[PDB]
């Protein structure tokens, strides 16, 4: 299998608009923090959609099948990475936002993130690849590749050499000027300090194998991530740079996305995950100072719509916990979302009731069996969007739900809305509000 | 790797096959004679890459000719020297066209299988039980015999000859001076308890297929806690329990080159030192040009600093203050300086010489320049001095202050001691026997740093030993604990007579010659006190 190093990255690196030629203030009249960046998967595009008016402001060409959008800490720069390893950086301040720089970082990739420590706004971006097993730290204004690190190495437990440790989720610390890198097959979480790329400080945390996705707790101090194939949640303290806990969720194949933080009426601050392998939702306590007896313990587990869930969501202004069932084989389940009333949760051991929102039905799609995927809130936390993902030559939609009432707010359809998948609100992504 | 039996791969289009016997004969030759320059994976090191994609384009005739006649640039003439028969030359040319099967990894399971604790810590002495002066003992490698000799520093008596791994490369001592660690070139580590009535190996372990370095934890408070070993093959280092040798943490060194940032599949671990400022090991990774500062305070949440340095890192030493690590990036003629307190690169300087080879080097206070560290060179006769005092001699710090000739090229080791006024330089690999069997000695007190070249006295070490027979090569000065006597090895072949020569440092005259039928191929010598304390 071919390697992909600095020479290869630099050959693919193009700066379309140099920093000095970009605006010094916002030159369009858009409401950038309420904008949604929506993947148009099979079109190799993204749509920038007004969070209040639902107007598609622009459709931009990107790498094929963008996996996620991430925002710089200032909210000015939009970063997307295709599954092919192509990264595009877009300047939202331009009169007509477009790609200002691009680069290829490997042959297979899923993650990108921006520096989020106070004082390091817009300084760096980082991308992780499945192939070659590596991550790369890039300049936050130009995408210049600055530091490439191989993730080949020893497994944490058996301590045997692994020739293919894929980089899974990448998050950014709010406590130290560090990136948080999950290395799947070796079961290591890397805390990479970007204050000095020549004298590179890292903390390689032995965790659990099969690390995938995860998120920070409400305080933004603790990183909670799924070692999915081992059904565990690994907790690392980003302030102290150390593993704090590893706990089994009781479910099969936890798949949080970035997860859902909320204040449980009985348990206090918790983070929740749903599962791909069963219908369960698990809650872990996230407050060692205030609720020490509940911290890092699995406090409750209860059913949602069905197996094949990918994303769980809430917002500080919402009383609701939304859970999709995207990969369920049954169209009636994959086309709907479960919604729990957080205010009604007692943690008495019973199974909280949920309301079933018929999201695909609300979108009115005649053909196929579209899959509903990934709740994402607007900046005010008053509306939540879901993608109604159908095939490239079929009819898809976005469905906007009024969070206060749980009623349909708006259906977004456009001929350009091809295979809509991930949706990222600028404000909630730049601030890690989830 | 050479003694490992492998399967003969089939031959693809346009290539001819080798029988099982032919392929195993070629494979043994490759690892015994070629991999040291061309790499275990055939990706190239001193010698060019020899992977099938490249060799199949060169063709059989080209390969056969190069192996037969060699070249002036460093590739031996295997065929015309008679080292390889005509049939073996062809076997190698054919072998290089065939796909190399993956060399064996050597992880935790394999290390633990090889790990033996002969005397549990609980069953060992609680105080020194022999009457030896351990701090003045010397641990001497008997290379080709796979042994070491423990020799009394004052009486010159061989106290014991212990069996170890083959061709021990160096001896290192725990910070307390109790435990003696040795590592053979095949990756075998032996730990010896010097407090026993009859010191012997108390624990042993294998850490790889090919290795050169071992070191002990030297941060105050961490005495005897850990040992670390580095391998050439697999490209990895391993931190082990300082009392039992239990393997605790194995780290691969495969990774990206610091400058071109390209993946390198075989970055060999070279020198390993121990910080006196932090609870860290200092690990040189040759091919990627990275110096790793590895914090052993927490092996689960492992903190490291990966310092971009210069490719071809090999050996080096700490300055007199034990704060700065000065190491040779030998093929690029540079010295790299790292601050172990702050954990950062502070300088990279060309020595003006070809292939600096300091060993741990030589620290002294130059009468006019201030604190300096010295290195000699394999590729020329020069001795270079670098300033090591950023606070007290600021303009001189990390600058090459002087460069002057010694006996000739082929130097490996330079040496001094705080109680000596002399700087000793060998010339082990010089082609001239008169030079290779002698050492140059400079008088530090007479150095003026006026730009002229300091004179040196030539000590005829091999002649003093009474050895001319065969090919005696003098190597590596090592002082006793008091810094009053300096020893040199007279390294002859295994079927020839060798010796150790003890020089009186005050008079620069012969003191004593150590000879013994057991003293086979004596190479490295390490005094317990000077090694435990990094006094050089
Ligand atoms: C490593 C990884 C992350 C974390 C990214 C980060 O931290 O920036 C992630 C996040 C994501 C997120 C992040 C949501 C969030 O709110 O953070 C989304 C929307 C997403 C949509 C999909 N992912 Fe994802 N995803 C993979 C990997 C990943 N997905 C796969 O290896 C996998 C299993 C298979 C694959 O074919 O790629 C897979 C399938 C999917 C989907 O089928 C989705 C729905 C669409 C698609 O194009 O493949 N993945
Ligand atoms: C990586 C390395 C170190 C640092 C050790 C540490 O930090 O603990 C070192 C040190 C050393 C030291 C350390 C002396 C000191 O005072 O620190 C000695 C005596 C030594 C005797 C030899 N070395 Fe050495 N040496 C190699 C590697 C190394 N040698 C080789 O790859 C090389 C070039 C070729 C080889 O075949 O091994 C090589 C040839 C030699 C010799 O020919 C010597 C004289 C004998 C021998 O067995 O090969 N090496
Ligand atoms: C270090 C001293 C070496 C040893 C031992 C061996 N080789 Fe070598 N080889 C070395 C160098 C520095 C070079 C570069 C070419 C030059 O001009 O010196 C080479 C080259 C070869 C080649 C040619 C490759 C090419 O030209 O692309 C071959 C086929 C080769 N070497 C084979 C080879 C074999 C089979 C060896 C074991 C018997 C061997 N080399 C030992 C350095 C060194």
Coordinates of N, CA and C in Angstrom, one line a residue, chain A residues 56-162:
Chain A
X56 N -30.8 28.1 0.9 CA -29.5 27.5 0.6 C -28.7 28.7 0.0
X57 N -27.8 29.2 0.8 CA -27.0 30.4 0.4 C -25.9 30.1 -0.6
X58 N -25.4 28.9 -0.6 CA -24.4 28.5 -1.6 C -24.2 26.9 -1.6
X59 N -23.8 26.4 -2.7 CA -23.4 25.0 -2.8 C -22.0 25.0 -3.4
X60 N -21.1 24.4 -2.6 CA -19.7 24.4 -3.0 C -19.1 23.0 -3.3
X61 N -18.2 23.0 -4.2 CA -17.5 21.8 -4.6 C -16.4 21.4 -3.6
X62 N -16.4 20.1 -3.2 CA -15.5 19.7 -2.2 C -14.9 18.3 -2.6
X63 N -14.2 17.6 -1.7 CA -13.8 16.3 -2.0 C -15.1 15.4 -2.0
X64 N -15.0 14.2 -2.5 CA -16.1 13.3 -2.6 C -16.5 12.8 -1.2
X65 N -17.8 12.7 -0.9 CA -18.4 12.2 0.3 C -17.7 12.8 1.5
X66 N -17.7 14.1 1.7 CA -17.3 14.8 2.9 C -17.8 14.0 4.1
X67 N -17.0 13.8 5.1 CA -17.5 13.0 6.2 C -18.0 14.0 7.3
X68 N -17.3 15.1 7.6 CA -17.7 16.1 8.5 C -17.2 17.4 8.1
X69 N -17.9 18.4 8.6 CA -17.5 19.8 8.6 C -17.1 20.2 10.0
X70 N -16.0 21.0 10.1 CA -15.5 21.6 11.4 C -15.2 23.0 11.2
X71 N -15.4 23.8 12.2 CA -15.2 25.3 12.2 C -14.0 25.7 13.0
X72 N -13.3 26.7 12.5 CA -12.2 27.3 13.3 C -12.9 27.9 14.6
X73 N -12.1 28.1 15.6 CA -12.6 28.7 16.9 C -13.2 30.1 16.7
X74 N -12.8 30.9 15.7 CA -13.4 32.2 15.5 C -14.7 32.1 14.7
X75 N -14.9 31.0 14.1 CA -16.1 30.8 13.2 C -15.9 31.3 11.8
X76 N -14.7 31.8 11.5 CA -14.5 32.3 10.2 C -14.3 31.3 9.1
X77 N -13.5 30.2 9.5 CA -13.1 29.2 8.6 C -13.7 27.9 8.7
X78 N -14.2 27.4 7.6 CA -14.9 26.1 7.5 C -14.0 25.1 6.8
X79 N -13.8 24.0 7.5 CA -13.0 22.9 7.1 C -13.8 21.7 6.8
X80 N -13.6 21.0 5.7 CA -14.3 19.8 5.4 C -13.2 18.8 4.9
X81 N -13.5 17.5 5.2 CA -12.6 16.4 4.7 C -13.5 15.4 4.0
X82 N -13.0 15.0 2.8 CA -13.7 13.9 2.1 C -13.1 12.5 2.5
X83 N -13.9 11.5 2.3 CA -13.4 10.1 2.7 C -12.2 9.7 1.9
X84 N -11.9 10.3 0.8 CA -10.7 10.2 0.0 C -9.5 10.9 0.5
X85 N -9.6 11.7 1.6 CA -8.4 12.4 2.1 C -8.3 13.8 1.7
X86 N -9.2 14.3 0.9 CA -9.1 15.7 0.4 C -9.7 16.7 1.4
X87 N -9.0 17.7 1.8 CA -9.4 18.7 2.7 C -9.6 20.1 2.0
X88 N -10.8 20.7 2.2 CA -11.0 22.0 1.7 C -11.2 23.0 2.9
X89 N -10.7 24.2 2.8 CA -10.8 25.3 3.7 C -11.5 26.4 3.0
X90 N -12.6 26.9 3.6 CA -13.5 27.9 3.1 C -13.5 29.1 4.0
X91 N -13.4 30.3 3.4 CA -13.5 31.5 4.1 C -14.9 32.1 4.1
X92 N -15.6 32.0 5.2 CA -16.9 32.5 5.3 C -17.1 34.0 5.3
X93 N -16.0 34.7 5.4 CA -16.0 36.2 5.3 C -16.1 36.7 3.9
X94 N -15.8 35.9 2.9 CA -15.8 36.4 1.5 C -17.2 36.8 1.1
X95 N -17.3 37.8 0.2 CA -18.6 38.2 -0.4 C -19.2 37.0 -0.9
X96 N -18.5 36.1 -1.6 CA -18.9 34.8 -2.1 C -18.0 33.7 -1.5
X97 N -18.3 33.2 -0.4 CA -17.5 32.1 0.2 C -17.2 31.0 -0.7
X98 N -15.9 30.6 -0.7 CA -15.4 29.6 -1.5 C -14.1 28.9 -0.9
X99 N -13.6 27.9 -1.6 CA -12.4 27.3 -1.1 C -11.2 28.2 -1.3
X100 N -10.5 28.5 -0.2 CA -9.4 29.4 -0.2 C -8.1 28.5 -0.2
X101 N -8.1 27.3 0.2 CA -7.0 26.4 0.2 C -7.5 24.9 0.3
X102 N -6.7 24.0 -0.3 CA -7.0 22.6 -0.3 C -5.7 21.8 -0.2
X103 N -5.9 20.6 0.3 CA -4.7 19.7 0.4 C -5.2 18.3 0.6
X104 N -4.5 17.3 0.2 CA -4.8 15.9 0.4 C -3.9 15.3 1.4
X105 N -4.4 14.6 2.4 CA -3.6 14.1 3.6 C -3.4 12.7 3.7
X106 N -4.0 11.9 2.8 CA -3.9 10.4 2.7 C -4.8 9.9 1.7
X107 N -5.0 8.6 1.7 CA -5.9 7.9 0.7 C -7.3 7.6 1.3
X108 N -7.4 7.5 2.6 CA -8.7 7.2 3.3 C -8.6 8.0 4.6
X109 N -9.7 8.8 4.8 CA -9.7 9.7 6.0 C -11.1 10.0 6.4
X110 N -11.3 10.3 7.7 CA -12.6 10.6 8.3 C -12.6 11.8 9.2
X111 N -11.5 12.3 9.7 CA -11.5 13.3 10.7 C -10.6 14.5 10.5
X112 N -11.2 15.7 10.9 CA -10.5 16.9 10.9 C -11.0 17.7 12.1
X113 N -10.1 18.6 12.6 CA -10.5 19.4 13.8 C -9.6 20.7 13.8
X114 N -10.1 21.7 14.5 CA -9.4 23.0 14.6 C -8.9 23.3 16.0
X115 N -7.9 24.1 16.2 CA -7.4 24.4 17.6 C -8.4 25.2 18.4
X116 N -8.7 24.7 19.6 CA -9.8 25.3 20.4 C -9.3 25.8 21.8
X117 N -8.0 25.9 22.0 CA -7.6 26.4 23.3 C -7.6 28.0 23.2
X118 N -8.0 28.6 24.2 CA -8.0 30.1 24.3 C -6.6 30.6 24.0
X119 N -6.6 31.5 23.0 CA -5.3 32.1 22.6 C -4.8 31.5 21.3
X120 N -5.3 30.3 20.9 CA -4.9 29.6 19.7 C -5.9 29.5 18.7
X121 N -6.9 30.5 18.7 CA -7.9 30.5 17.7 C -7.3 30.7 16.3
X122 N -7.8 29.9 15.4 CA -7.4 29.8 14.0 C -6.0 29.5 13.7
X123 N -5.2 29.0 14.7 CA -3.8 28.7 14.5 C -3.6 27.5 13.7
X124 N -4.3 26.4 14.0 CA -4.0 25.1 13.4 C -5.3 24.3 13.1
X125 N -5.1 23.4 12.1 CA -6.1 22.4 11.8 C -5.3 21.1 11.8
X126 N -6.0 20.0 12.1 CA -5.4 18.7 12.1 C -6.3 17.7 11.4
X127 N -5.8 16.8 10.6 CA -6.6 15.8 9.9 C -6.0 14.4 10.3
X128 N -6.9 13.4 10.3 CA -6.5 12.1 10.6 C -6.8 11.1 9.5
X129 N -6.0 10.2 9.2 CA -6.3 9.2 8.1 C -6.4 7.8 8.6
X130 N -7.1 7.0 7.9 CA -7.3 5.6 8.0 C -6.1 5.0 7.3
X131 N -5.8 5.5 6.1 CA -4.6 5.1 5.3 C -3.9 6.3 4.9
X132 N -2.6 6.3 4.8 CA -1.6 5.8 5.7 C -2.1 6.0 7.1
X133 N -1.7 5.3 8.1 CA -2.0 5.5 9.5 C -1.2 6.7 10.0
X134 N -1.8 7.8 10.0 CA -1.1 9.1 10.3 C -2.1 10.2 10.6
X135 N -1.6 11.2 11.2 CA -2.3 12.5 11.4 C -1.4 13.6 10.9
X136 N -1.9 14.7 10.5 CA -1.1 15.8 10.1 C -1.7 17.1 10.7
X137 N -0.8 17.9 11.2 CA -1.1 19.3 11.7 C -0.8 20.3 10.7
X138 N -1.8 21.1 10.3 CA -1.6 22.0 9.2 C -1.8 23.5 9.7
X139 N -1.2 24.4 9.0 CA -1.4 25.8 9.3 C -2.9 26.2 9.2
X140 N -3.5 26.9 10.2 CA -4.9 27.2 10.2 C -5.3 28.2 9.2
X141 N -4.4 29.0 8.6 CA -4.8 29.9 7.6 C -4.5 29.5 6.2
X142 N -3.5 28.6 6.0 CA -3.1 28.2 4.6 C -3.3 26.7 4.3
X143 N -3.4 25.9 5.3 CA -3.4 24.4 5.2 C -2.0 23.9 5.0
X144 N -0.9 24.7 5.0 CA 0.4 24.2 4.9 C 0.6 23.0 5.8
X145 N 1.1 21.9 5.3 CA 1.4 20.7 6.2 C 2.6 21.0 7.0
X146 N 2.5 21.0 8.3 CA 3.6 21.3 9.2 C 4.2 20.1 9.9
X147 N 3.4 19.2 10.3 CA 3.9 18.0 11.1 C 3.0 16.8 10.8
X148 N 3.7 15.8 10.3 CA 3.0 14.5 10.0 C 3.5 13.5 11.0
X149 N 2.6 12.8 11.7 CA 2.9 11.8 12.7 C 2.3 10.4 12.3
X150 N 3.2 9.4 12.3 CA 2.7 8.1 12.0 C 2.0 7.5 13.3
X151 N 1.0 6.7 13.1 CA 0.3 6.1 14.3 C 0.6 4.6 14.3
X152 N 1.5 4.2 13.4 CA 1.9 2.8 13.6 C 2.6 2.6 14.9
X153 N 2.4 1.5 15.6 CA 3.0 1.3 16.9 C 2.4 0.1 17.6
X154 N 2.6 0.0 18.9 CA 2.2 -1.1 19.7 C 0.8 -1.0 20.3
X155 N 0.1 -2.1 20.4 CA -1.2 -2.2 21.0 C -1.0 -1.9 22.5
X156 N -2.0 -1.2 23.2 CA -1.8 -0.9 24.6 C -1.7 -2.1 25.5
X157 N -2.5 -3.1 25.3 CA -2.6 -4.2 26.2 C -1.6 -5.4 25.9
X158 N -1.7 -5.9 24.7 CA -0.8 -7.1 24.4 C 0.6 -6.6 24.1
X159 N 0.8 -5.3 23.8 CA 2.0 -4.7 23.4 C 2.7 -5.5 22.2
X160 N 1.9 -5.5 21.1 CA 2.4 -6.1 19.9 C 2.3 -5.0 18.8
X161 N 3.2 -5.1 17.9 CA 3.3 -4.1 16.8 C 2.0 -4.3 15.9
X162 N 1.4 -3.2 15.6 CA 0.3 -3.1 14.7 C 0.6 -2.2 13.5

